[PDB]
Amino acid sequence: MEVIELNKCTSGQSFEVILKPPDPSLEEIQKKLEAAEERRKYQEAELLKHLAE
Amino acid sequence: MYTFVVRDENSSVYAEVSRLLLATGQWKRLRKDNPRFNLMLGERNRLPFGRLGHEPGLVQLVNYYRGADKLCRKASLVKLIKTSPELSESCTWFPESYVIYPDEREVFLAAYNRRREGGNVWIAKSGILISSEASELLDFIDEQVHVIQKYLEKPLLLEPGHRKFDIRSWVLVDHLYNIYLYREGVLRTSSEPYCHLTNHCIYGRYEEGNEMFFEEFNQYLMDALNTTLENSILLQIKHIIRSCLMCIEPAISTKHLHYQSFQLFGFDFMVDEELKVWLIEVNGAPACAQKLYAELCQGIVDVAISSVFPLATSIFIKL
Amino acid sequence: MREIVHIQAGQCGNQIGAKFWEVISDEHGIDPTGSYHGDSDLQLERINVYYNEATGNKYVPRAILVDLEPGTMDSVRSGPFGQIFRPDNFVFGQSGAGNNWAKGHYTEGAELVDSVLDVVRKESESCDCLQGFQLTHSLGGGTGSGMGTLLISKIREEYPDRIMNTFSVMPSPKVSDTVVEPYNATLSVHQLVENTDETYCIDNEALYDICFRTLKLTTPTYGDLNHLVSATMSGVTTCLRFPGQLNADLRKLAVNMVPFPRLHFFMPGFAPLTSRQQYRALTVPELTQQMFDSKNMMAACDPRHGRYLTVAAIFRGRMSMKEVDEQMLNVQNKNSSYFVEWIPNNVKTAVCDIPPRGLKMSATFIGNSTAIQELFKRISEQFTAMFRRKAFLHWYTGEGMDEMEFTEAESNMNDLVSEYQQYQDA
Amino acid sequence: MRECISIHVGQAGVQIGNACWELYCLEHGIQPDGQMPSDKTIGGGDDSFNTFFSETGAGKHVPRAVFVDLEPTVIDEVRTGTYRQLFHPEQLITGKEDAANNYARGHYTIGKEIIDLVLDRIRKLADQCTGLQGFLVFHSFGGGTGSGFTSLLMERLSVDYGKKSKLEFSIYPAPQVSTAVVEPYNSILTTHTTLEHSDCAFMVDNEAIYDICRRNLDIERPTYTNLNRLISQIVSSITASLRFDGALNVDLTEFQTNLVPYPRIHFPLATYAPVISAEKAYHEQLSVAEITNACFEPANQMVKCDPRHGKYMACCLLYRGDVVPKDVNAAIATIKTKRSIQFVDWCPTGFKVGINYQPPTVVPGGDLAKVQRAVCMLSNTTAIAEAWARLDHKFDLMYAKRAFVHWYVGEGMEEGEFSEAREDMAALEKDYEEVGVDGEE
């Protein structure tokens, strides 16, 4: 057991004890959001088409 | 009413425990995947311990100790004894053993040669081969991890018959980690003159089914050797059971855990001609003798199950 | 501010709707003149869900009253709370619907439906954020059944992204006005399958049996049946009218109760129900046991003949919340056979501190059970008994309907029954 | 000095953020009106508490915080609460209708319409930073806003602040206080979308906080207020190193360096002790050894699981109060001989210890007793994968029947995202298993 990296200050201290060694771009996100919005508009159009019948 | 599920249809012990619970009128069996249970009689392999104790308003109990496999697998039992200071490599009741992978291959040869230079018969298991020299033992294993163990060349031989045997002890550990030894053991005796393997799978000459129980065996030790089963053997058996289970208790105990565990173990012992007891293996999912099924399974319900889920002379020895 | 627009259509819909508004006006401290006179701020915290605030701190129900004859709505306006409704929200004709779905849906109702939608549009335009609609109606008559489902179809067309909820009274031969009720109910059920998100199935057979066998009323009236409904309608909307965490709005309720879009027909229940002993204090174990008993549920279906997909339970009054959890998890773990294992934790529990006017404690049950198929089976059997001989069809063909539309309605409900049987075995 | 911005999303995130900033003000001596009589540099400064607080010329200390919710009732309580004067309206963003416990509604339908406004308000706080180091994101797994909108915001934050670190405080769903049946869906959906955008996430299982409140605080039916005051204590223990003078975990990147060797396995287990009821007149004050021993009791963990059957990759000890390094080492030596503490072979078997002398602050009138010393242990153990296993099992049960799926597809999401999210969780469970894992007889 050993204590290393002992740093002390007025509000406390810290140290280490060793016991044994051994992204999508903006356009890509915009496409996904608009693709889901298109699918919502398509389902709503089918609904209104169904209600018109 | 209490609820339980069955996840191992092949367990003769808990197939009897389940029908005992279904005979008290206070236990109902659910479908095997219904999570709203009080008691799980779980599967032998890959039991989902991580999904236990997360049902609000349910005290959940399981019939297996997570992590007890370290004691019930041959390779890990050797590693546990040689690395745990509670047992030490100087352990006197466990035969000299080595874990080798097809590694302690070099340490095994140094010990083997040092006594062949000065009898050294060993055994291989994990599919059993008993050879007299080391070159033949290593070739059979390369045909999974195995262990080479010193073979007991001088066993205690029953008379008449000049026959080998082994002792099976059943041990129940409840949720409070009380260690209960069933007062009834069985001797799986060989029917051939010394015949080297005494497993019940491998007849009926001197006793029915090659099974001698403690009453007859104790009577034999008094007539032939002028001693008792309690003094000559059972003190060592109780000592070995306590040593093994207390060693792994901090690793497997469920005292402050969100679910509780109990488990039935099968301890296999051997006795040499000097009446010294040796530990062979520990069994995590053991079967029982046909006569002792009713008494032991009822003891499991009384000690391990009803202690947590109460209903509306003990057969165990508390260690 | 998530406002709900209430609509009551036809004789049954308006008489039940009237009692509902009387009941929740008392709970929120609203007198028959629209003035608040309560003593708790919990009564006003979510009062905008059902009431508009007019000049002078008066509260006007966001309710629209619809009928094809004036009779029932005249009696409502002359009723106890009749003056609380906005007079413009009375939309009625004069010809009536003659217990005829075709008249309500295709001829007489079509002439009036645009006037109702004008009032609906006016109430919606004054909503900070309208969340949906609730319709009170019967399925056995002509106006509530035929025109009510016509209203739903046209409301969905104009507000496709809003929740549609109904309290639908199912007909029964034991409590029957005309023999064509199975025809009208079969035609309406298909509309509800397509165009509602939540439908509380209220069986007049169950209401009668509860009044007779439990409440010990020898000769129940329609007023006795409507008394049970208003108490149930108050219970199932407690989560919408008072502060709470669970099922707080119509869309969250639908997300928790409807695993499959077409299977959105709920069995309601109320506890306690006792004869007149009535002063005896009720305990939490007693509320829970009655709430889950079949004799307390109003769809006339045995839940032990099916399995629960989702369950909502609301407890009202001052009681031990710990004791509420215990008994709820007690009946749930003791009868886990009747809950589907493939929807974990499908029983949600809510507690409201404010009890009903006359009780210290009460409980309301909302179950989406596959046993509701027994209700649609009964209606299908009664429909087929007449349709196989084309009996009484001339009332409908005389309004322009064809026999094919009846055949399709028969098939749609048999399909609905089969869909429930699919998940009852799963 | 490098500033940190806190983001609170949904009811759970907002109500927890409210409890933290109340505790922060008590710890730093900041009054509800924003005044701080100990800050002698009026109108500016680069002190350690300035990482979480900006300053106005009038001397008001303003949290570097954004509150966002899709319905206004929860954030309205912040507008009228005790610390209402602390925030200006730009920090509080509300919609009119919520995500209805539907990930797809929070992520796609409503999220697309409010994400630009949220980023604009966040940019306003970022522009007031001389050296922004990243964000702390508070949200639930089960809510439609906390799951759906957070995973969208985390994607855009990686685009607009690619160099900045992101830490999460996430509320794991527990049926005892859960408000929705589809919370396993939303949890898996948001973990999949957020996994590559979060550098370190602290999960808190409501079931664990609930049971700690019942056992240790003697509260028969804990409320969100009870749970949030306990959560705010653990959160304060984790963020104290950024807000006070010290040398351990002094910036957000050190959290990843000290706790997360593998980028995907970034879910440290938190354990806190002691939790002591304020109703009892006298409590025996636990020692350094006793509170350090309690860090290895499953009953004190933020997620109930068994670290004995996993492997450690890292372990930090954060003490507050009367603690000297001599007693910590003596406690570690005693514990290591009696506990099952096994590390992976490629990591050192050791502990990084941080001590802050100021004892933990308790809210006046709260349920927590004032103690002389406390400790929070942050350990990266593979045992926390038990929480993923429970969650993925509930997912599998409902998804096999496609229960409730239509609600998500109806909002523009595809069924393939469900299985795509599930396969990622299957891979995540496999990564934990690779790192931490060694009849009728």
Ligand SMILES: CC(=O)O[C@@]12CO[C@@H]1C[C@H](O)[C@@]1(C)C(=O)[C@H](O)C3=C(C)[C@@H](OC(=O)[C@H](O)[C@@H](NC(=O)CBr)c4ccccc4)C[C@@](O)([C@@H](OC(=O)c4ccccc4)[C@H]21)C3(C)C
């Ligand atoms: C509902 C309810 O309690 O029903 C029973 C029946 O089983 C319950 C149990 C009771 O204890 C028992 C028996 C009462 O003895 C009680 O003295 C009493 C209450 C509390 C009265 O109900 C109230 O005042 C409530 O606050 C109430 N509002 C009204 O009902 C309007 Br009047 C309400 C309920 C739920 C939600 C919101 C508001 C009703 C009742 O007539 C009596 O029911 C009926 O005879 C009845 C007949 C036919 C159909 C339905 C009920 C009653 C009277 C007698 C006045």
Ligand SMILES: Nc1nc2c(ncn2[C@@H]2O[C@H](COP(=O)(O)OP(=O)(O)OP(=O)(O)O)[C@@H](O)[C@H]2O)c(=O)[nH]1
């Ligand atoms: N610990 C804690 N958990 C909370 C709190 N509020 C909600 N939760 C949990 O969060 C989950 C519900 O998600 P919410 O945050 O309330 O929902 P939301 O993020 O607002 O999303 P929507 O309401 O659907 O728009 C449930 O599991 C709750 O138990 C809280 O104040 N404290």
Ligand SMILES: Nc1nc2c(ncn2[C@@H]2O[C@H](COP(=O)(O)OP(=O)(O)O)[C@@H](O)[C@H]2O)c(=O)[nH]1
């Ligand atoms: N529960 C209840 N059912 C009613 C009431 N009035 C009529 N019904 C039922 O509703 C059906 C008749 O529909 P009704 O509302 O009178 O026709 P409508 O006015 O044209 O919509 C029959 O099944 C009746 O049993 C009532 O006040 N209460």
Ligand SMILES: [Ca+2]
């Ligand atoms: Ca300053």
Ligand SMILES: [Mg+2]
């Ligand atoms: Mg009528």
Ligand SMILES: [Mg+2]
């Ligand atoms: Mg919300």
Ligand SMILES: [Mg+2]
């Ligand atoms: Mg064996």
